[PDB]
């Protein structure tokens, strides 16, 4: 199945409170495999997974370095962005980026991205082709001409097409179990009394791994996701998650309602009724 | 393994 290895970078200037906070987080798929923090006691790239243990002290040191570079590397950006917009010092700002790629079973490269986010609104980014850049505002204009008149596109393109990939593989080589493991959600339902001879039926799902899941309520073979009630998935806070949904149904009319839990770690979707 | 980003 498709897989990824994206990198999340963020530098936020805290004028006065010192030098900007900078840190990058590594994600092979949606698991956190490595991060680095400026406000760290001992700044150093840190292994956010047992298996990352198989990576040498050299690896750490290496990226450790590479990081610190990018550290002051972004420090610059900040100034530069500031100048470009005509805004004087003072307002703490946040630069963020997502650089990454996506290989799929055959190893072919599905997608490569590098996107610059300034203070929360799209700055610039490398198009699908991996050759041009797209930017908003007369300012971000100045920036493209730069990255292009320097080869950036190309050099970037190599990382994505070659580096992130060769590595993404390696990571998977050793992270497998941890990344390929499953945990079947545990569901149940609840009856919540309510005025006007009606009750709230809530379908609980929790203890499941892979964070993607779908829940649905039915009344004899018909979807009710419509006037239903949902909650963004809850990090169960222990390598697993939680999610529920519910709907109002006349009292007594419970037995006629059914919830469905479809989750990739389930041979047969889960089916509950009251 | 990460990139060596450029300025702006």
């Amino acid at each position, epitope marked *: 199945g498709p897989h990824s290895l994206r990198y999340f970078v963020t530098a936020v200037s805290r004028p006065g409170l010192g030098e900007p906070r900078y840190m990058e987080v590594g994600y092979v798929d949606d698991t956190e495999f490595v991060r680095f923090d400026s406000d760290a006691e001992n700044p150093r790239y840190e292994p956010r997974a047992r298996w990352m243990e198989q990576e040498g002290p050299e690896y750490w040191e*290496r990226e450790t370095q*590479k990081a610190k570079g990018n550290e002051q590397s972004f420090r610059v950006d900040l100034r530069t962005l500031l100048g470009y917009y005509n805004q004087s010092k003072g307002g703490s700002h946040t630069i963020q980026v997502i650089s990454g790629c996506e290989v799929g079973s055959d190893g072919r490269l599905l997608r490569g991205y590098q996107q610059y986010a300034y203070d929360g609104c799209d700055y610039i980014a490398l198009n699908e082709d991996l050759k041009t850049w797209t930017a908003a505002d007369m300012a971000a204009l100045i920036t493209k001409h730069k990255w292009e008149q320097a*080869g950036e596109a190309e050099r970037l393109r190599a990382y994505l097409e070659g580096t992130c990939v060769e590595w993404l593989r390696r990571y998977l080589k050793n992270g497998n179990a941890t990344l390929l493991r499953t945990d079947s959600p545990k569901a149940h339902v609840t009856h919540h009394s309510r005025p006007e001879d009606k009750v709230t039926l809530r379908c609980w799902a929790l203890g499941f791994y892979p964070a993607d899941i779908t829940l649905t309520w039915q009344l004899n073979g018909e979807e009710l996701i419509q006037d239903m009630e949902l909650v963004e998935t809850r990090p169960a806070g222990d390598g697993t998650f939680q999610k529920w949904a519910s709907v109002v149904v006349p009292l007594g009319k419970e037995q006629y309602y059914t919830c469905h839990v479809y989750h990739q770690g389930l041979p047969e979707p889960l089916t509950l009724r009251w | 393994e990460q990139y*060596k980003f450029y300025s702006v």
Partner: T-cell receptor
Amino acid sequence: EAAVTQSPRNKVAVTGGKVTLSCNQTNNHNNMYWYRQDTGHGLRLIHYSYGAGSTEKGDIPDGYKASRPSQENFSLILELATPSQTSVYFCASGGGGTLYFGAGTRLSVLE
Amino acid sequence: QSVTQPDARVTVSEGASLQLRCKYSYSATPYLFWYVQYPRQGLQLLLKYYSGDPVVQGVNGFEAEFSKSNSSFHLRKASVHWSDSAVYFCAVSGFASALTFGSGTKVIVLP
């Protein structure tokens, strides 16, 4: 175009002399440098920047200092000059690793 | 972070094939390069290897082949031509926008 103007290109200076070499560019390359061409060691990195203000140490730091005022003017500065700092100095602009070097400078400080 | 041009001097008969050794140490895919320097002017780039095809085709019959097993980015041009007599340097880009050059190799092609 993209010129790496490196001046002066030569100087005979005295020991304990403060000598500054400047490098003007037109490559718009944020990354500027100062390397030193000497036999048995080839070239070596003195100092490097990422844009006005950004300044850090290379591998050959002792005695050398540097300034980054414009997205253009970079400059390796030697105050406590000693002949050990005798060599062909080279600076350069660069995006990721496409270093554009300059004409050079024959640095001859004497006793 | 390490580079090595075992031989800093090699003389060859014009016409003939030329292969300048180069080794490097860094447990990862560095950014390797090769610059040319002839009389007085500074450095000149021949090519660059970031990632991708181990065999790079560059300016003036110059090409190289990257390799792992035990490191290398040996330069290559088969039909050497006098004017090529010079100093060819091999650089790497380790922990950020730097260019850790190695000693170097002065080649001489007798006509």
